[PDB]
Amino acid sequence: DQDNEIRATDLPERFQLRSIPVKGAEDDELEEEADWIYRNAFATPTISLTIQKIKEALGFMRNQHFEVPFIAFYRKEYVEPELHINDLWRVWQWDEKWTQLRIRKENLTRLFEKMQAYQYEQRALDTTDMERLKDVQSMDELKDVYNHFLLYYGRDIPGLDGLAKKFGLTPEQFGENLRDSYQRHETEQFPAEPLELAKDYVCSQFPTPEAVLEGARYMVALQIAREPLVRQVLRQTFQERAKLNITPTKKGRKDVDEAHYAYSFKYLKNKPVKELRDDQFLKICLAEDEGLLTTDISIDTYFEEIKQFYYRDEFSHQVQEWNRQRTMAIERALQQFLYVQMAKELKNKLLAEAKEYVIKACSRKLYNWLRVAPYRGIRVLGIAFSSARDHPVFCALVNGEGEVTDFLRLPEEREKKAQDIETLKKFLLNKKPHVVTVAGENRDAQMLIEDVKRIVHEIGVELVDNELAILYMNSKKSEAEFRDYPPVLRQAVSLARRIQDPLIEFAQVCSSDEDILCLKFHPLQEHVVKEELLNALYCEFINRVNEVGVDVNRAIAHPYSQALIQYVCGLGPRKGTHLLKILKQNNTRLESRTQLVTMCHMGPKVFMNCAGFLKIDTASLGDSTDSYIEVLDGSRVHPETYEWARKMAVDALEYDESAEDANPAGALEEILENPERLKDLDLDAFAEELERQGYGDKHITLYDIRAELSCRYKDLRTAYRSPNTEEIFNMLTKETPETFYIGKLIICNVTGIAIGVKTRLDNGVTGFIPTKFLSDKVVKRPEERVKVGMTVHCRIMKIDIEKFSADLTCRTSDLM
Amino acid sequence: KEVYRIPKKSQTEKEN
Numbered sequence: 001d002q003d004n005e006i007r008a009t010d011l012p013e014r015f016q017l018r019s020i021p022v023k024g025a026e027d028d029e030l031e032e033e034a035d036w037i038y039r040n041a042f043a044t045p046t047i048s049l050t051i052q053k054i055k056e057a058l059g060f061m062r063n064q065h066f067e068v069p070f071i072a073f074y075r076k077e078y079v080e081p082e083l084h085i086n087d088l089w090r091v092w093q094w095d096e097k098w099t100q101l102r103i104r105k106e107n108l109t110r111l112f113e114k115m116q117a118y119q120y121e122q123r124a125l126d127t128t129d130m131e132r133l134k135d136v137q138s139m140d141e142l143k144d145v146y147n148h149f150l151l152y153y154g155r156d157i158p159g160l161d162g163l164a165k166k167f168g169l170t171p172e173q174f175g176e177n178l179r180d181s182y183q184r185h186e187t188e189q190f191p192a193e194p195l196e197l198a199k200d201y202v203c204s205q206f207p208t209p210e211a212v213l214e215g216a217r218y219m220v221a222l223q224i225a226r227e228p229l230v231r232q233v234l235r236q237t238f239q240e241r242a243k244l245n246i247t248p249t250k251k252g253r254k255d256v257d258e259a260h261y262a263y264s265f266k267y268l269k270n271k272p273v274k275e276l277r278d279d280q281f282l283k284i285c286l287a288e289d290e291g292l293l294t295t296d297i298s299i300d301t302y303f304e305e306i307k308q309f310y311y312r313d314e315f316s317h318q319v320q321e322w323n324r325q326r327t328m329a330i331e332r333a334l335q336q337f338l339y340v341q342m343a344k345e346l347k348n349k350l351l352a353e354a355k356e357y358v359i360k361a362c363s364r365k366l367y368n369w370l371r372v373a374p375y376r377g378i379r380v381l382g383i384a385f386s387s388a389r390d391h392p393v394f395c396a397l398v399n400g401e402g403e404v405t406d407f408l409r410l411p412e413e414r415e416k417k418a419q420d421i422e423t424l425k426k427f428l429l430n431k432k433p434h435v436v437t438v439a440g441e442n443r444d445a446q447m448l449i450e451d452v453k454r455i456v457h458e459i460g461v462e463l464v465d466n467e468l469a470i471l472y473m474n475s476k477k478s479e480a481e482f483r484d485y486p487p488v489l490r491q492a493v494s495l496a497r498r499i500q501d502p503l504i505e506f507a508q509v510c511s512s513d514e515d516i517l518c519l520k521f522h523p524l525q526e527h528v529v530k531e532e533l534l535n536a537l538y539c540e541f542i543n544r545v546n547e548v549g550v551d552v553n554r555a556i557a558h559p560y561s562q563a564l565i566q567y568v569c570g571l572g573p574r575k576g577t578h579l580l581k582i583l584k585q586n587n588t589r590l591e592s593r594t595q596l597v598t599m600c601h602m603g604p605k606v607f608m609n610c611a612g613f614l615k616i617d618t619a620s621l622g623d624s625t626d627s628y629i630e631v632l633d634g635s636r637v638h639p640e641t642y643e644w645a646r647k648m649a650v651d652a653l654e655y656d657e658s659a660e661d662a663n664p665a666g667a668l669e670e671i672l673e674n675p676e677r678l679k680d681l682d683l684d685a686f687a688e689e690l691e692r693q694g695y696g697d698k699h700i701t702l703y704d705i706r707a708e709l710s711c712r713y714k715d716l717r718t719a720y721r722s723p724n725t726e727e728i729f730n731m732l733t734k735e736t737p738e739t740f741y742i743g744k745l746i747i748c749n750v751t752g753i754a755i756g757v758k759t760r761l762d763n764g765v766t767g768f769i770p771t772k773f774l775s776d777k778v779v780k781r782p783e784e785r786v787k788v789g790m791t792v793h794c795r796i797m798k799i800d801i802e803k804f805s806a807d808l809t810c811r812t813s814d815l816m
Numbered sequence: 817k818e819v820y821r822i823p824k825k826s827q828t829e830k831e832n
Contacts, residue, residue: 651822658819679830686822693820710831 003574010603012067013572020099025062029102033058036101036137037094045353046239046346047276053083057091068092068539069546069569070609074638076700085547089539101139108146109133115153123152132228140345144231151226159201163216164223166190166197167326169310171220175229177309187312193321217329224330225337234334238342241299244271246284252292259745262287273297273350278361279524282354285347286527297343303334355528362521362528363536366506370544373717374501375462377401381433382499383410383452384469384491388444394485395424396492397431402500402560404493406431407485425455432459437499439466439491440731442764443804462499462722465731469494471518472509481560497560499720503544507563510541542567549636549713551615553589556580570609575602590616591625593633594642612638615713631669636708644690644698645705652681668709675710729801733763740806742796745815748808749791753781757808759792765804769794773810785810 006016015022025033034054056078060066066075072085079088112129119125132145168188169177177184190197198209198216206212224230246268248256256266261283265271287293310326312319377400385393392411398404408427410420428436436456438449445463452461472478472494473487482490498505510516513534517525525533545567555561565576582600583589590596593616597607618634632642646664649671655662671677683706687699707714723731730736748759748767755777759767774782786792795814798807809815 647820647822651824654824655821657821658817676830679828679832680824680826681822682824682826682828684828685825689820689822706831 006572007574007578008601010605011065012570012606012609013575014067015065017572018096020096022062022065023099025059027059030058030062031055033095033098036098037091039137040097041090041094046242046273047278047281047350047353048274049278049353049357050082053079054091057083057088058095061092061095065605065609067569067609069542069613072543073546073569074612074701077697080700085543086539089543093535097139101136101142104139104142105133105136108136108142108149112149115149115156118156118158119153140235141228141232144226144228148226148228151222160212160215160219162201163197163212164219167216167220167329168312168322169326171223171227172229174224174310175227175231175233178230178233178306181305183309183311187310187322187326189312189319190322193318194325195321213325217325217332220326220329221333221337224333225341230338234338234342235345237299237302238297238346239273241302242273242297242346243299244268244273244276244284244295244297246271246293246295248293249291252287252294256287256292260292262293266293268295273346276350276354278357279354281350282358282524282527285351285354286524297346298339303331306330306334355532358522358524358528359533359536362525362533363540365521366519366537366540367544370503370506370540371717372502373715373719375435375499375720377500378434379405379432380496380499381428381436382439382464382492382494382496383437383448384439384466384488384495385441385444385448386488387442392488393448394489394492395427396489396496397427397433398493398496398500400500401554401558402497402504403558404482404496407489407492421451421455424452425458428455428459434459435499436461437464437495438462439464439469439495440728441466442732445732446728462720463728463731464495464499465723466491466495467519468498468505468509471515472505475509475515477509477511503548504561504564507541507545507567508560510537511563538567542569546613547716549613549615551617552583552593553617553620556583556589565614568610568613570606570611570613575606589625590614590633591621591628592616592630594630594639595633608638608640612636618712631665631672635712637705641698641701641705644695644702645709648678648681648683648686648702648705649709651686652677671709678706678709681706725802729804733765733804735763740796740799742799744796745793746796747791747793750786750788752788757782757786759794759808761806765806767794767806767808768800769808769810770797773808 006013009016011022034051037058038051038054056075057071060071060075060078061068068085068088071079071088083091109129112125112133116125116129128145132148136142136145168190169185173185194213195209198212201216202209202212206215246265248262248266252262252266256262260266265280265284284293284295288295307327307330310330311323379397379400381395381397383393383395385391392409394407394409396404396407408423410424436452436459438445438452438461440463449461449463469491473490478487478490478494482493485493494505494509497508510519513530516534516537517530521533521537545564546569550564550568551561552565555565562576562580565571565579566573568576571579579596579600579602586599588599593611593614596602596611596614597604602610616633618629618631621629632639632645637645646668649667650657650662650664652671653667655667683702684699687697687702690696690698726737746761746763746767748761751758751760755774756771757769757774759769761767771777774785776782794808794810796806797809797814800806
């Protein structure tokens, strides 16, 4: 079984998963790799949205088998400051593209060699086999080289050419002229007119020698449109000078009006591709797929410029015929071969760029979710609810370790609310929770949080987003962990766990691709490729897991946290589960982290990759566990650098190197009691002396091995702030600032004249038609304008996000 | 004998 060798091999689990297996480099193919990656992944795209660093990163990844986290987090001096974690991820992604292109090039080179052998057995390949195949810097021009090969040599797997050659300026020369923008190669006259040469070749397929002229022009057009140089020049022309024309289809004119997303570009005219926004072209292509819109990509001319080259000057009247034939051959080639294919290529590139922006937006949103810290374990009480109309509210007190301790149900109306408040206060007094979190669903969250505040002040109370809790509730894992609890109780535990630490909850509830895709990272998330979006999200998870480090001894004791050691560097689903299985079977919990290889069977390369990103809670151990404890194991420091720590501590204590009493362990076990002593050590002078001894540059590593001994796994996440009023508005309302289109038409229900007209929106937002339109402050009520109770649809003219109030319009003139 | 010490000669002021 593949899983068996994957768990048994010595390479990172994520290295075997990739389709293109990681094969070593040569330092000459590696340099070409770096140049190609730098040129292609760091080139300006078509829509508005150091090489030694790439060389070092590629060398690490492909020869040292260092995962992107281990390069980012322990190889900074090699890649920084010009390469970061996401840059390393992009480099490793583009390595796959380089390998694919190289394999394609090798296959095509072998084909061209076999074809050369076959021809030698019998045009031919003299420098094209070298010039083209060797000079293939993209998959697109690889198609240009191959398809050009198929045009001529594709016939043989084991006479219109006469006219085409008698057409002047052989296609390679036409490509040269186009690339130079001037007639580098002159045309070749003939001592006759096209028809006379036509009589020679007009025999069976093309009688009526005009037909042989048509055939010859078609052959010339094929040869021109298949020429790699003409392909390059025309693709560049499309890239720089490309317009986007859009019109709505019969199905599109009617159903796209100020609310369909394609309204802003329902009609376009000469919209340059350079001005396409982040995801605008993705929306354009989605609208075109829906059949309510039609587009085309062109430059309008360019044909007039091109025709000047494949042409001759004199007016002999026997070259005007040749000139006209050449002009119309170029016309046909451009109109039916080059324009269409170049439009297809440009459309694919633009759509892929829009997809990439959408994926990046989803990744950034996930980053913001996972980069939100814990709160300041802690006993967290989580309150969750629903419409609340004949539906109770559940609050769950989740222990600091993350395990729910107990729950409480909180189901004329005034006395019932009073009794609920009394029982909630009783619960809070009995079991004091550090933080009370209220889920975010609607306006009722504000009232719930305010009541909780009124209770607590007689200890914080914070509103919490409710979107991962819903996914947890609907998931089967919630049923598995809590067979007795109702769904709303699952929401409370999810909210408490997320507030305690989002990463630990996001990884546990987003256990599969389907679960992660349930979340809403971006409106167009559903249209991007599933593989790329999933890879981006898992890369964000890996980054935040390695930048946090996963505490081993807690993932075992509390199996809720097991999901975190999937995203550890070096240590994957199979590898992580195998490590957990080994720990469980041995019935032993890591007193020490160099113990990984000692008690488990994980290879040198995996240990190197993973072990920097595993935490050991050395302050929590006691009883029989006191028997064996390596004190450095409680930190971000890794067992290749454990000698430099035990020198840095000795030097910071000014221990006499000549005293047999300089115990380097005891020096650390004094520095980890008094970390302020490490401030008196000159790390730059210490690093220069390590470099002189031949240990290499370690300046940045020593600053980490200091900052880490100053605080064991120093958390860098931004603290759990309370959401800004904008956050509350977009959370409880469940729509974004873009969704609140000032001037949007909304169906609202009128409730009652408190001097204005209170209209309740379906979005849970109060709508106040202004008295200006109402025209009655002390005058008779606005009943004449509209009857109270029913629903009307109007247009927004103002917003009150801090109060959940939005202006409306009564006049149809505003509606227009 | 063969010996080395990281020098406490540092002018960086104990990181405050």
